[PDB]
Design a protein around this ligand. Structure first.
Ligand SMILES: *[C@@H]1O[C@H](CO)[C@@H](O)[C@H](O)[C@H]1NC(C)=O
Ligand SMILES: *[C@@H]1O[C@H](CO)[C@@H](O)[C@H](O)[C@H]1NC(C)=O
Lengths: 49, 48
């Protein structure tokens, strides 16, 4: 009746590639991927920071 | 004799000469979206 639903720009598969990249940076590099290039650090040491 | 849509439009019918049951599907429609670069850049367009 004249109604429609448009799709989102990012598919749920693209949004899960972003939450994937946010997980992968957070674990491997701490906060440092938000400040600049992702500086790796051991996760046992990141949790001690 | 008829079937109904939520807006009280008709969704199906039984024909009054042959008692077969017909769907009514509305004739195909949609939004036309014109993808365009600036008219400054080109007069070429694509249509979604
Ligand atoms: C239409 O006419 C035919 C005979 O020509 C008949 O069999 C049929 O039952 C008629 N339709 C109705 C609704 O009676
Ligand atoms: C628009 O056209 C002018 C023509 O001189 C050009 O200088 C400008 O770069 C164009 N801009 C874009 C966004 O197409």
């Amino acid at each position: 009746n004249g109604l429609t639903v448009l799709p989102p720009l990012l598919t749920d598969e693209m949004i899960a590639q972003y939450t994937s990249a946010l997980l992968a940076g957070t674990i491997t590099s701490g906060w440092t991927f938000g400040a600049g290039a992702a500086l790796q650090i051991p996760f046992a040491m990141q949790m001690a920071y | 004799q008829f079937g109904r849509d939520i807006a009280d439009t008709t969704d199906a019918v039984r024909d009054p000469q042959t008692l077969e049951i017909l769907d009514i599907t509305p004739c195909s429609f949609g939004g036309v979206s014109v993808i365009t670069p600036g008219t400054n850049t080109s007069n070429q367009v694509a249509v979604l």
